[PDB]
Amino acid sequence: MKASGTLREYKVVGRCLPTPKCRTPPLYRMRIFAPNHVVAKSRFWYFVSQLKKMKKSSGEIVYCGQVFEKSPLRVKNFGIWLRYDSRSGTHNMYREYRDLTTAGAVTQCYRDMGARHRARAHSIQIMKVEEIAASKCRRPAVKQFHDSKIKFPLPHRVLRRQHKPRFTTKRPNTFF
Amino acid sequence: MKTILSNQTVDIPENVDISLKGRTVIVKGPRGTLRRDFNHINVELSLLGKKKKRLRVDKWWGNRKELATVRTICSHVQNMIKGVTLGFRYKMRSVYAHFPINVVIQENGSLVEIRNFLGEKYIRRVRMRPGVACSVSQAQKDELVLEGNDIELVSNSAALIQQATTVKNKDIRKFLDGIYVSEKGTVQQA
Amino acid sequence: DRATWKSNYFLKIIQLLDDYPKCFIVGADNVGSKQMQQIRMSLRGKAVVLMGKNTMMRKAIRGHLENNPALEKLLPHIRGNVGFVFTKEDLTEIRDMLLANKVPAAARAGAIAPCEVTVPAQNTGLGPEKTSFFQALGITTKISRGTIEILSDVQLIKTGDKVGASEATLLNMLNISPFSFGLIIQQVFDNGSIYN
Amino acid sequence: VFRRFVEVGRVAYVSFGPHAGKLVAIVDVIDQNRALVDGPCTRVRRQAMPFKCMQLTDFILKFPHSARQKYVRKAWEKADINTKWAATRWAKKIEARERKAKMTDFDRYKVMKAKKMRNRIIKNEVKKLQRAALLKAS
RNA sequence: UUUUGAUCCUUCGAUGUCGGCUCUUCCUAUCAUUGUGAAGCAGAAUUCACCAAGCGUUGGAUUGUUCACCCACUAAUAGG
RNA sequence: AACGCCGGGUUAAGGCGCCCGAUGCCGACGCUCAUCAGACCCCAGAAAAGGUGUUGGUUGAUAUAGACAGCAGGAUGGUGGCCAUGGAAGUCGGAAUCCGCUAAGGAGUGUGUAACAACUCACCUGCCGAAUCAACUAGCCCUGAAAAUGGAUGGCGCUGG
RNA sequence: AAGGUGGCCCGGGGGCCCCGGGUGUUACAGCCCCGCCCCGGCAGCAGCAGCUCGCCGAAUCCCGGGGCC
Numbered sequence A: 001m002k003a004s005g006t007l008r009e010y011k012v013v014g015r016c017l018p019t020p021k022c023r024t025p026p027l028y029r030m031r032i033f034a035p036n037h038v039v040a041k042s043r044f045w046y047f048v049s050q051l052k053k054m055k056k057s058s059g060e061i062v063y064c065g066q067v068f069e070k071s072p073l074r075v076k077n078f079g080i081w082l083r084y085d086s087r088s089g090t091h092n093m094y095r096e097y098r099d100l101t102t103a104g105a106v107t108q109c110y111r112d113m114g115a116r117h118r119a120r121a122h123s124i125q126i127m128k129v130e131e132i133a134a135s136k137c138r139r140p141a142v143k144q145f146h147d148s149k150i151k152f153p154l155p156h157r158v159l160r161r162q163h164k165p166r167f168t169t170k171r172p173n174t175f176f
Numbered sequence B: 001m002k003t004i005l006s007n008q009t010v011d012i013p014e015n016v017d018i019s020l021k022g023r024t025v026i027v028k029g030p031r032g033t034l035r036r037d038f039n040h041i042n043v044e045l046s047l048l049g050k051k052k053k054r055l056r057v058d059k060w061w062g063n064r065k066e067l068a069t070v071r072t073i074c075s076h077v078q079n080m081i082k083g084v085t086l087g088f089r090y091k092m093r094s095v096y097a098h099f100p101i102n103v104v105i106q107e108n109g110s111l112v113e114i115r116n117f118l119g120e121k122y123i124r125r126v127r128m129r130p131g132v133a134c135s136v137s138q139a140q141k142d143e144l145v146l147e148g149n150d151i152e153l154v155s156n157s158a159a160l161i162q163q164a165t166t167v168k169n170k171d172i173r174k175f176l177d178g179i180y181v182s183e184k185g186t187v188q189q190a
Numbered sequence C: 001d002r003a004t005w006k007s008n009y010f011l012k013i014i015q016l017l018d019d020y021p022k023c024f025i026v027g028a029d030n031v032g033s034k035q036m037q038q039i040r041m042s043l044r045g046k047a048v049v050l051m052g053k054n055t056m057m058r059k060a061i062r063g064h065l066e067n068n069p070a071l072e073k074l075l076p077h078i079r080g081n082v083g084f085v086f087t088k089e090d091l092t093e094i095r096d097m098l099l100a101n102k103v104p105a106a107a108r109a110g111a112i113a114p115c116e117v118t119v120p121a122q123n124t125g126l127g128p129e130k131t132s133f134f135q136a137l138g139i140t141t142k143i144s145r146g147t148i149e150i151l152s153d154v155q156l157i158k159t160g161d162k163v164g165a166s167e168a169t170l171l172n173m174l175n176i177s178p179f180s181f182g183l184i185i186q187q188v189f190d191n192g193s194i195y196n
Numbered sequence D: 001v002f003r004r005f006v007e008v009g010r011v012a013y014v015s016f017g018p019h020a021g022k023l024v025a026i027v028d029v030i031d032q033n034r035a036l037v038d039g040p041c042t043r044v045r046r047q048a049m050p051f052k053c054m055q056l057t058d059f060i061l062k063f064p065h066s067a068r069q070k071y072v073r074k075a076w077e078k079a080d081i082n083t084k085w086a087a088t089r090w091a092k093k094i095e096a097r098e099r100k101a102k103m104t105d106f107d108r109y110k111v112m113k114a115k116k117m118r119n120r121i122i123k124n125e126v127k128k129l130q131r132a133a134l135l136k137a138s
Numbered sequence E: 001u002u003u004u005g006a007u008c009c010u011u012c013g014a015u016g017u018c019g020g021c022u023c024u025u026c027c028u029a030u031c032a033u034u035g036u037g038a039a040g041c042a043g044a045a046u047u048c049a050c051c052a053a054g055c056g057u058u059g060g061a062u063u064g065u066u067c068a069c070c071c072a073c074u075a076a077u078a079g080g
Numbered sequence F: 001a002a003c004g005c006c007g008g009g010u011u012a013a014g015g016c017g018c019c020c021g022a023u024g025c026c027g028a029c030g031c032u033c034a035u036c037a038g039a040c041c042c043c044a045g046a047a048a049a050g051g052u053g054u055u056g057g058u059u060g061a062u063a064u065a066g067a068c069a070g071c072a073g074g075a076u077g078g079u080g081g082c083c084a085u086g087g088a089a090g091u092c093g094g095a096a097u098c099c100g101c102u103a104a105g106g107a108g109u110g111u112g113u114a115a116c117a118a119c120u121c122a123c124c125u126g127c128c129g130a131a132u133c134a135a136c137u138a139g140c141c142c143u144g145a146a147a148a149u150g151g152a153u154g155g156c157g158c159u160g161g
Numbered sequence G: 001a002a003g004g005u006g007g008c009c010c011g012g013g014g015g016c017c018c019c020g021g022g023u024g025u026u027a028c029a030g031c032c033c034c035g036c037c038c039c040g041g042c043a044g045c046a047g048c049a050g051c052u053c054g055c056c057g058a059a060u061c062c063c064g065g066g067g068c069c
């Protein structure tokens, strides 16, 4: 699965269809991160297939809805649990990112895993996403930001709109 | 990771009078002046406080490579203070087994002629660095004394004479000849 | 584990400190543990001796400051090679015994000198040996028929000087310290009352 | 030798994007390169905005790092930032820039004639001053 | 890929097939020389390794021989 | 992707420093410095094993009731421990491995010793004040990496790409 | 409860004022959660506060400009 743009979070539930043996099978819920309801339903089927005797053909999906960020203007610290396949072997992780939304964070995880491990999106499975408090946050890149009087400058300021003149007299300054 | 901030202060004594044009530092005091350029290093050198009691040196957004350049400055400045106030006396004793090394000083301690090393006809006309004062001590048979403000120039000139008197093609574990540094200290103690 | 032994130290420090309110803050400086067992053997029943981690004492005492303020003056006192010497029996005799009891150990070639160290004129106690250790320094040593005899007395080390190995060797041979390793008194403390 | 610092409460001028030409306060910090921003009185919604685009001034309206928009509106009106802004020379050379884009052809002609005259007067007075300095020298 | 073999895509209306002589340049996996490290390196003599291929590496008896073996000098009588 | 001869529009697989039509986006997040760097199916070449180069992870110990270096001082007592043996008295084998002061002290790391001497080790006081230590794993780079006319990521060149 | 605002203590910078450090829970700054007040009540509404996040038009129509024939 390509992670194009930015993910949504969807609440998928489904079930096996009735049979003469059991007239009312239990419903099953998941939390799929995906761009759309089509790839959501597909990934749902893959996980259910890994755990339960259940295929898309033998069953049906009852409900796929989008789930909004209930607190979008608060800032949060998300804590993700992973499962990734190496070139050689598989490995579990626990990674902390610092974002506003579940989706923004998951995106950031994908991009980081890609940088640091060249892990391609299909290999990865998401198993738990928990918002975690500053007290319980372990990783020092996060821990440094919890401070009321944070302060820093912008030192070296690389110019943008380089080509708009392309030809000036004055050499550009970057110190303000 | 990108560390948001590092800094380290050096509380200087009242005798010295530093000043700075940006990165280039100048330090004056009793024994003389000392300038030193840091333009390669890229840091914030704040000279805050009345009585000029302390230097502070910030470093915003540094990684592991860039954090190492703070304490190195701190130390280079401290040694500069020693060089302006007290100075640097590098002692070094001439070791030999059988053949005695006839040493002689030229140009009021700038130059050093070293004769009869292992009975070699070649003679080592070693030149000291600028701002260095060679001198044979008194009350000691085999004793050079190199005085000066800059430790760098002193110590390099020391190694110059040391590597100049080196035994080629021989078992150095046995033939323990040549000049060797013994005691590093200052002109006046504190 | 280290965390539980530390909390155990807090279990000793609170019970003896609350029950017994009186300490002699003596300083066990470089004294050996065998010498310590002889002094503990002397003050086995009556006294109860203590050392530990400086911050371990800092928080045990900060805990004491809520209930018993008597240990408020102790916080600055545990500094240098310092330890408490809790005691119920008597104050002046334990003070004199603690200042006295020192076993003369070997002379250290290296530590600082408070006062002048001395080298008396006395025979070596050997056969024909190398005179260069004594004649290097500047002491008159004669060969009284084979056996070496010392002519004149000279004081080698002065107040505040590093003890070399050569100047150390004669104290190592005699095994007689000028000043013994020991336990130095700091202050007396009787129920919230300092004695200099 | 840094003079302006990113401090919660500091005002920034928006260079480009959708919200160009607008003033806005830095409410909070997320990371090295992304901050929470809001400008209630200038018609800008509470939103994320990277430090890249913005360029910070020397004004620091005071409020807590997580203060909800009410206390910001009151503190903004209380300080009266907008007027001090309009006093700044900055804004004046911005309005000049814009008037120069708006420049009409008739105004362009009147201006050319104004220049022509103002510069002939200056040329006369300056030449008399140079002969005056020669007179002073002589 | 300096041996040898395995293969048959190219040429049989013809690519002159073994050795020596003469001559140029080229590679380095350094025999010797220059500078240096290590040795169960005291000095001498001798071993191992790094930079380095710019300059050198012979005269003869026997065999068509390449190869082989031997005498003599050498700093060295390295390999392609 | 398949073709009669043409005008207009749009696309595929590929691409957009300049050669060479097109980003002269205020494009987003990160990694990496190589005195042999690296650059897109088939493709025209390299590995096992390393690295206190660096970036992340896992597990297990340690931590503000405050370590771990560091400088110093002790750096040892039952005890020549019993069984082995000839001796393990700290230092072939083999049995031992409990106790004391305790801040801590093994029937002992090395030099040096049949074991001591001499130098020396684990363990802790003095000061010191926040995070520290060990073993694994995978990411990039590096070592491992030699052949003959002068030479080829297509060239020029490229290190906020 | 705290990423601790005023108060208190220690420092460090000025001779009553300014800057670091330490306890702590609203006080002249705030944040977090439960219950009850007609889903508490008021506009407005995928918001010209011209881009905080989407999917659509029998639940949708209009106007304008260029090119070729």
Ligand SMILES: [Mg+2]
Binding pocket: E008, E009
């Ligand atoms: Mg064929």
Ligand SMILES: [Mg+2]
Binding pocket: none
């Ligand atoms: Mg032919």
Ligand SMILES: [Mg+2]
Binding pocket: none
């Ligand atoms: Mg022919």
Ligand SMILES: [Mg+2]
Binding pocket: none
């Ligand atoms: Mg080579």
Ligand SMILES: [Mg+2]
Binding pocket: none
């Ligand atoms: Mg030799």
Ligand SMILES: [Mg+2]
Binding pocket: none
């Ligand atoms: Mg091309």
